[PDB]
Each structure stands twice: as structure tokens, then as C-alpha cells.
Design an enzyme around this catalytic site. Structure first.
Site, mmCIF file in Angstrom:
data_model
loop_
_atom_site.group_PDB
_atom_site.id
_atom_site.type_symbol
_atom_site.label_atom_id
_atom_site.label_comp_id
_atom_site.label_asym_id
_atom_site.label_seq_id
_atom_site.Cartn_x
_atom_site.Cartn_y
_atom_site.Cartn_z
ATOM 1 N N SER A 42 55.017 10.433 59.788
ATOM 2 C CA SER A 42 53.653 9.953 59.540
ATOM 3 C C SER A 42 52.543 10.820 60.136
ATOM 4 O O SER A 42 51.371 10.586 59.853
ATOM 5 C CB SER A 42 53.489 8.503 60.028
ATOM 6 O OG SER A 42 53.987 7.570 59.084
ATOM 7 N N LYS A 45 50.210 12.127 57.639
ATOM 8 C CA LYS A 45 49.094 11.310 57.140
ATOM 9 C C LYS A 45 47.733 11.865 57.560
ATOM 10 O O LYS A 45 46.728 11.599 56.912
ATOM 11 C CB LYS A 45 49.227 9.846 57.590
ATOM 12 C CG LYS A 45 50.357 9.064 56.903
ATOM 13 C CD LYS A 45 50.401 7.638 57.450
ATOM 14 C CE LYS A 45 51.292 6.715 56.623
ATOM 15 N NZ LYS A 45 52.720 6.901 56.963
ATOM 16 N N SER A 97 49.351 3.103 60.146
ATOM 17 C CA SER A 97 50.284 3.998 59.458
ATOM 18 C C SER A 97 50.800 3.396 58.148
ATOM 19 O O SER A 97 51.992 3.484 57.837
ATOM 20 C CB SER A 97 51.471 4.339 60.364
ATOM 21 O OG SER A 97 52.037 5.584 59.990
#
Length: 264
Positions: A42, A45, A97
Site C-alpha cells: 500500500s 498508494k 488504505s
């Protein structure tokens, strides 16, 4: 590790690669295998957020479809047929997230494949040439787990921190997100904000292939640092990722400002 001669030995920690750099000057203070590629989970991201902030109006909206809502959790709670703003989706993306937030942002950006191509193009403009996204969320995709390096992660985070909206979001303790019954308060999962005075942002990640990842920044005593940590697992009674991050920041802030091992 590589650290400057004569500096205090950096305590052992769960992260197998990591880097400590100065957010403003780009000096690298210390690193361990900082150019070795591992899956980003993540943390990628942040790269999606950069693309979204470049291309999307924060108040522009999208109607989520069924496909947007079908990835595994974490989920912020995107629901099909419901309208969301880019800002709302970015809060979901960066505070909790949300993979559903990532896929819905990818929808606004022209789809999954297009969004991944835009993320990879963005990494290249930043000189992050060891970075390859395969999904908007950092989940394993058909193209594989993807790749980044501790070095590339801080390069990407440094670019993101320069954006005033990103800097605001990553530091927010909470945000309002749409729900059936109106709006639900979501909280920032980055515990560094709560545990480490001077933290200004961060993004955590985990997958089976990536193990634990983290990128983030702090400011103390007039200096601002950015760190990244990849491919780590916490052992019972060992330091946690939050511990090692605080240890790296502390070490960096205590370092003689003239000392360094290279540059970004």
C-alpha cells in the site's frame, strides 16, 4: 547498513531495507539495501495519490460501480451507485488504505490499466526508475506484486509532501466519509502521528509478498526527514515497525547535520 563514519550505531529492526533522507536537501543520512527492489504493497498508494492530485479536481465526483467495490479489504466502504468526491476518495485512500478507494480513483482516472500506466509514467518523471506499479492499490495484480525501493519510496513521498493538499491529508487525524446514514468519521491509521511528536505524514502497507512496508516523514529542530522501510516482519518481543521508525527518525535528528552517505 551504510551510515556515516563515527555516527551512533543504528539499532537492529524488523525492516530488511530502509533509508533515512533529508526531505529538503535530498541528502541521504543512512541506508540499508536502499536500492534493492521489493513489493511496495500500500505504500504505492502514495504514487496513486500524486496522479490523482495532478489530474483530478478535488470536488469532481464519480458514481461508483460494482467493480470498484470488489477488492479485498482494507475498505473505506465505497458502495455501488453512490457518488463520491476525489477528496473523499483520497481521504479513504490515505487514512485507512482503502483498496475500494484506490479502485474508484482509478475509475476517475480512466480505468485500472490506464491508471497503472499513469502511475508508472509519474514514477519515471520523478527519477524513481526502480518502481513499477501493477495495481492502483498495491495488491498483487496480474502483472505481479510490483516493485519499489526504499530510495524510490522516499523520492515519491518527497514529491507528494510538496503538494499542500497531500501534506494536509496525510497529517489529518480524521475525515468524514459518506455512508448510508449520512457521513461516518474515519480515522488515520498512521500511528506515528500519535506516537511521535513532529511526524508529518506516513503510509503503511502489508501483503504476503511485500511483508511490512512504510514510508513517512517528520520534522524536528528545523530539519525535516523522510524514511522508508521495506520487507519486514515483527518478531515477538522485538521492535515493531512503529518502534523502528521512531528509532530511525531519532537517529537522524541526532546526527551531525554535515554527515551523510549520499544523495537522492
Amino acid at each position: 547498513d551504510v551510515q556515516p563514519a563515527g555516527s551512533v550505531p543504528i539499532p537492529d529492526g524488523p525492516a530488511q531495507t530502509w533509508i533515512v533522507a533529508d526531505l529538503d536537501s535530498g541528502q541521504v543520512l543512512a541506508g540499508r539495501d536502499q536500492n534493492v527492489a521489493h513489493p511496495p504493497a500500500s505504500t504505492i498508494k502514495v504514487l496513486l495519490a500524486l496522479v490523482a492530485l495532478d489530474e483530478l479536481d478535488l470536488n469532481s465526483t464519480v458514481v461508483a460501480d460494482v467493480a470498484d467495490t470488489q477488492a479485498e479489504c482494507n475498505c473505506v466502504g465505497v458502495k455501488p451507485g453512490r457518488s463520491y468526491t476525489a477528496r473523499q476518495l483520497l481521504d479513504g485512500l490515505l487514512l485507512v488504505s482503502g483498496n475500494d478507494a484506490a479502485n474508484t480513483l482509478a475509475h476517475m482516472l480512466g480505468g485500472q490499466d490506464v491508471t497503472v500506466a499513469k502511475m508508472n509514467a509519474k514514477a519515471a518523471t520523478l527519477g524513481a526508475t526502480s518502481t513499477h506499479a501493477t495495481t492502483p492499490s498495491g495488491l498483487d495484480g496480474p502483472g505481479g506484486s510490483g516493485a519499489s525501493t526504499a530510495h524510490d519510496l522516499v523520492v515519491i513521498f518527497r514529491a507528494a509532501m510538496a503538494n499542500p493538499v497531500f501534506a494536509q491529508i496525510t497529517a489529518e487525524p480524521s475525515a468524514m466519509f459518506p455512508s448510508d446514514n449520512g457521513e461516518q468519521l474515519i480515522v488515520n491509521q498512521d500511528e506515528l502521528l500519535q506516537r511521535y511528536p513532529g511526524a508529518i505524514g506516513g503510509k503503511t502497507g502489508y501483503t504476503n509478498a511485500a511483508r511490512k512496508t512504510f514510508v513517512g516523514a517528520a520534522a524536528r529542530g528545523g530539519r525535516r526527514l523522510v524514511i522508508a522501510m521495506m520487507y519486514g516482519l515483527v518478531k515477538e518481543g522485538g521492535p515493531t515497525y512503529w518502534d523502528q521508525a521512531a528509532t530511525l527518525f531519532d537517529w537522524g535528528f541526532a546526527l551531525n547535520p554535515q554527515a551523510s552517505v549520499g544523495s537522492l
